[PDB]
Design a protein that fits this description.
Chain C: Associates with the pre-60S ribosomal particle. The structure is cut from a larger assembly and holds chains A, B, C, D and E. By secondary structure, chain A is mainly alpha-helical. Chain A is built from nine helices and five strands. A three-stranded antiparallel sheet of chain C has the order 2-4-3, covered by helices on one side. Chain C starts with a helix and ends in a 26-residue tail after the last helix. The chains are: A mainly alpha, B alpha+beta, C mainly alpha, D alpha+beta, E alpha+beta. The structure holds two RNA strands.
Chain lengths: 187, 174, 193, 154, 183
RNA sequence: CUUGUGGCAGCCAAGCGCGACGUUGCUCGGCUCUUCCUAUCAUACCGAAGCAGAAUUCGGUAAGCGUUGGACCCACUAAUAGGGAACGUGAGCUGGCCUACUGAUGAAG
RNA sequence: AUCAGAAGAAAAGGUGUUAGUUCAUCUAGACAGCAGGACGGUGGCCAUGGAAGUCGGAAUCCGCUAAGGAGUGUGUAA
């Protein structure tokens, strides 16, 4: 249980990821979510749209539309946000668009209990939050996609340098004569 | 967990009826006591022998003779519904006679929302001949060249940890 | 029930007097079959049903050496109760699909001729839609934009080729019969020539 | 234009080139369209779909098988309204099986109450005498207050 | 049922790769690539056989097999010898002016029933339009994929429509004549 | 709760003595206003209809935008649609403190 | 499930799905598919400008066969 953790949200389910996240926040862990666009919802795309046009129809509220603001709404329903226990738990949850620089250099963990592939029967209809919100009033679908591609270029380039580096240590690992004693201890 | 129960009993002998006949039943029940209750229900609705004039001579439990041998079971049942009468005959392939009935209770209450009291078991028989089998999926399961990937690939190996919140890598699941 | 009646009729046909004919039907219409049967009973029912009813084994079969003749016996053939007419007289009939066109018949452009120029009535208004060829029904008359060859020599009779030939006068067919052998009561020599 | 003016244009110019396969295509895919009708629509027009579907279903099954102090009730002559007053009844003869509008000569007895019988109020089951010369007491087999007509059986 | 197998005999082509649910099929005519992530299916390429297998699938997923098989047949025939869609023009009173631009990729139609609209159609990529001089008003639609050529034919048909009139009196328009391979 | 299908008497009558659909029988009240609903008056786009065209009728989506001036009427207009706010708005209208909303400043990281 | 799910309309409708029940054929070749035949008295008789099976009125008969319905629609004035 690190003080700060980063949850990649690509392929996670909005409802089942939030329930896991909401509990961790109440435990005191500073959870930061990234790539909130690629979240998923069970049900075909047009269905999740209509359940969202009901939200916009509900009016005096502030129908926040960005995918991070959709997820933050999901968590705010599983916290006691009226009390100062949840009001101080909401502020630890930082949900962002894509991966800002101060987090793209950090290891991103995934929740096994809320991934789309492990939780949906094959062939089931589902929608992507990023695409959905971009058809509800979001206006930054294209820019985040371009920025994500650029980071992918740098991250992939970073791996190739690291891949060769570990290959050198991979090639020099067997030179140690203690490998036999390593085998005897199973290490 | 059900058990096979061979239940044999007769009515109380009297001067009018000195030698009652020994009836026999192969009925299923989670315990010995439930077997008696189902016995009296099965017989009284049919043969009209009163509870208070009846005694039970022997309750025995029948372990599966050849549990390791795969078998196909034919199960005649009578559905009770809004109408209350349906001659339904289901077939299940498994290893234990009790296990087949368990699934039959599983399917009857799932596919058709039946209730244990409502459903009365008519007869459970073995189907030793593939020709005697009547179900295409069982017929296909009985083919010489059975082969299929393990379905529900995620259900295999699942996650395999105690409380694995925040796995550090994506699961292959393949 | 009908199959049993056909088998019974086949057995009676096998029990006929003589002439051991083997011919029931062909690509020719029922009128041609009736005309052929007029100079005589032709009946086949289901193909190979009579052979199956008779039995491949000689013991089951009423005839002799029917095991080899059963494989030879195929198509629309049947007994009857002649040789020169079958060998020589072959009534012409319109061709059907599956055969090869003897030549390359074509349809002239513009106004069409029902007799391929041997007359060309233009009253066949429903034929314009029923044709499907590149023809335009202008001023109440079908006009062909370009000439269309109905078929070609050495080419299989296509569905469109067969459809055009049905309306046209293309009798590129000749009836044939099979009399290789005779199932004589005494001789019992069904030659395979 | 004159007479069947569109029937010589078809005669002289020809038919819409693609009408027949379009109508054949429409006559085919309508089977899927009919089912999609019942799975989407709601309301009265869906309700009108229901019994009209069953009507042709049962009819099809038949052919293939063959293959203030005032009177609140109608009275006969409190306050009795003239509109509520009725003098003609479409009494249907039982044996004859012919329904005829006969004048209400009089009311024999009203089972509701003797006061209603005195007032000559027409009610269901009341006995009324009607002339049968053109063809006697008769019992009202309906409620004229709701049906709007004096329906009775001889 | 637990298994549902479909087999395909590969014609000449060049390559029929199923790399990552993406048939980048290359034939003698050319190369075409389509996605296959629309359905979850096992597609094995071996020898001269392509196996499409459904495991423990519902009838909804079972219906996708023949559709995919019909789909996979379309481009493999297209990449081998191509596909040609013959187009015929019928006009009642006003002759229709047809022009071809960028070697026919874009078709503009003019003088439609007195109307004065230069209806422009940018036909979808992979299909080009040509005017046949052998027969007048004959338009050839060449491509390597039926769904693209037919959709362009459907598009040119719907933009070639009549408004608020009687269909059985007006006959001008554009309509499908017939299909076929290039060779 | 309420909406678009009269009743009675028979003949049938799939079926379960009833018996559906069929069939016979003649027979308190209104001005302004604010919104909201669609069950659409017009306008938008479609379908069908003997739809030449013009003009017309029915039907489908459609509540975005409108839906009058004068004592049942008489003209314009594209039409002059129907309603609800259960004692519509009689504590807007007549006859037989605080909280809203609108505005105006405002100390503060 | 394009407003899923967590007695009132209620009778039924659904080319939605999974189970079953009762009947049918089926290597005498099941269904579908294409390939062809789908006849001749006869254009039966009234009915009519024109009705040849297909506007219409009672049957609606026969020879051939494995099968051609005085015809199931399309269609034509026919």
């Amino acid at each position: 249980f690190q003080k700060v953790v980063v949850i990649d949200a690509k392929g996670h389910l909005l409802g089942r990821l939030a329930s896991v996240v909401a509990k961790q926040l109440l435990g005191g862990q500073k959870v930061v979510v990234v790539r909130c666009e690629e979240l998923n919802i069970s049900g075909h795309f047009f269905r999740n749209k209509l359940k969202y046009l009901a939200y916009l129809r509900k009016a005096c509220a502030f129908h926040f539309r960005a995918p991070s603001r959709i997820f933050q709404k999901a968590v705010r329903g599983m916290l006691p946000h009226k009390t100062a226990r949840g009001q101080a738990a909401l502020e630890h949850l930082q949900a962002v668009e894509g991966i800002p620089p101060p987090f793209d250099k950090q290891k991103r963990v995934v929740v096994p209990a809320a991934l789309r592939v492990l939780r949906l029967k094959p062939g089931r209809k589902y929608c992507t939050v990023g695409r959905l919100s971009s058809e509800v009033g979001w206006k930054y679908n294209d820019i985040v996609a371009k920025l994500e591609e650029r980071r992918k270029v740098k991250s992939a380039a970073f791996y190739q340098a690291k891949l060769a580096k570990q290959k050198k240590i991979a090639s020099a690992k067997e030179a140690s004569p203690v490998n036999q004693k390593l085998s005897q201890f199973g290490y | 967990a059900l058990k096979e129960y061979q239940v044999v009993g007769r009515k109380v002998p009297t001067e009018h009826e000195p030698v009652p006949k020994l009836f026999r039943m192969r009925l299923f029940a989670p315990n010995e006591s439930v077997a008696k209750s189902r016995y009296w229900y099965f017989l009284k609705m049919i043969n009209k022998v009163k509870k208070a004039t009846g005694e039970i001579v022997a309750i025995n439990e029948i372990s599966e003779p050849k549990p390791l041998k795969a078998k196909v079971f034919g199960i005649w049942i009578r559905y009770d519904s809004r109408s209350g009468t349906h001659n339904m005959y289901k077939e299940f392939r498994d290893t234990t006679r009790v296990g087949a009935v368990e699934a039959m209770y599983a399917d009857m209450a799932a596919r058709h929302r039946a209730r244990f009291r409502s459903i009365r078991i008519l007869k459970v028989v073995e189907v030793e001949k593939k020709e005697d089998v009547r179900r295409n999926y069982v017929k296909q399961l009985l083919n010489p060249h059975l082969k299929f990937p393990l379905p529900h690939r995620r259900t295999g190996v699942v996650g395999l940890a105690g409380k694995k919140v925040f796995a550090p890598h994506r699961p292959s699941t393949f | 029930e009908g199959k049993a009646a056909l088998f019974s009729g086949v057995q009676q046909s096998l029990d006929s007097f003589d002439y051991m004919w083997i011919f029931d039907v062909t690509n020719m219409r029922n009128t041609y079959l009736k005309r052929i049967r007029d100079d005589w009973r032709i009946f086949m029912g289901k193909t190979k049903v009579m052979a199956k009813a008779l039995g491949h084994t000689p013991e089951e079969e009423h005839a002799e050496n029917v095991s080899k003749l059963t494989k030879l016996l195929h198509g629309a053939v049947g007994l009857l109760f002649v040789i020169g007419y079958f060998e020589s007289f072959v009534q012409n009939d319109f061709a059907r699909a599956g055969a090869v066109a003897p030549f390359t018949h074509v349809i002239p452009a513009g106004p069409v001729y029902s007799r391929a120029g041997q007359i060309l009535t233009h009253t066949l208004e429903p034929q314009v839609r029923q044709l499907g060829m590149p023809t335009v029904l202008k001023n109440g008359v079908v006009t062909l934009l370009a000439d269309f060859p109905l078929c070609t020599e050495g080419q299989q009779l296509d569905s469109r080729q067969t459809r055009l030939l049905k309306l046209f006068g293309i009798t590129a067919a000749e009836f044939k019969v099979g009399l290789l052998g005779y199932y004589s009561k005494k001789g019992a020599s069904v030659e395979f020539l | 234009p004159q007479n069947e003016y569109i029937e010589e244009s078809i005669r002289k110019h020809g038919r819409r080139f693609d009408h027949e396969e379009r109508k054949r295509k429409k006559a085919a895919r309508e089977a899927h369209d009919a089912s999609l009708y019942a799975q989407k629509t709601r309301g009265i027009k869906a309700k009108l779909y229901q019994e009209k579907r069953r009507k042709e279903k049962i009819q099809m099954k038949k052919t293939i098988k063959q293959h203030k102090r005032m009177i609140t009730k109608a009275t006969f002559v409190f306050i009795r309204p003239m509109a509520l007053r009725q003098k003609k009844a479409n009494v249907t003869h039982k044996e004859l099986g012919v329904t005829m509008q006969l004048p209400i000569i009089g009311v024999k007895k009203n089972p509701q109450s003797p006061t209603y019988t005195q007032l000559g109020v027409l009610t269901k089951g009341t006995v009324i005498e009607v002339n049968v010369s053109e063809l006697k007491y008769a019992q009202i087999t309906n409620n004229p207050e709701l049906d709007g007509c004096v329906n009775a059986l001889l | 049922d637990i298994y549902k197998d479909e087999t395909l005999t590969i014609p000449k082509g060049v390559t029929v790769d199923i790399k990552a649910r993406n048939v980048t099929v290359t034939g003698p005519r050319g190369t075409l690539k389509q996605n296959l992530r629309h359905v979850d299916i096992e597609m094995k390429k071996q020898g001269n056989t392509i196996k499409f297998i459904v495991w423990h699938g519902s009838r909804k997923h079972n219906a996708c097999i023949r559709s995919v098989y019909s789909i996979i047949n379309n481009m493999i025939i297209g990449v081998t010898q191509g596909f040609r869609y013959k187009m015929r023009l019928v006009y009642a009173h006003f002759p229709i002016n047809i022009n071809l631009t960028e070697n026919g990729t874009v078709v503009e139609i003019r003088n439609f029933l007195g109307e004065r609209i230069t209806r422009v159609i940018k036909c979808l990529p992979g299909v080009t339009v040509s005017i046949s001089s052998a027969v007048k008003d004959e338009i050839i639609l060449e491509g390597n994929s039926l769904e693209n050529v037919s959709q362009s034919a459907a598009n040119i048909k719907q933009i070639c429509n009549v408004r608020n009139k009687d269909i059985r009196k007006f006959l001008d328009g554009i309509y499908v004549s017939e299909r076929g391979n290039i060779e």
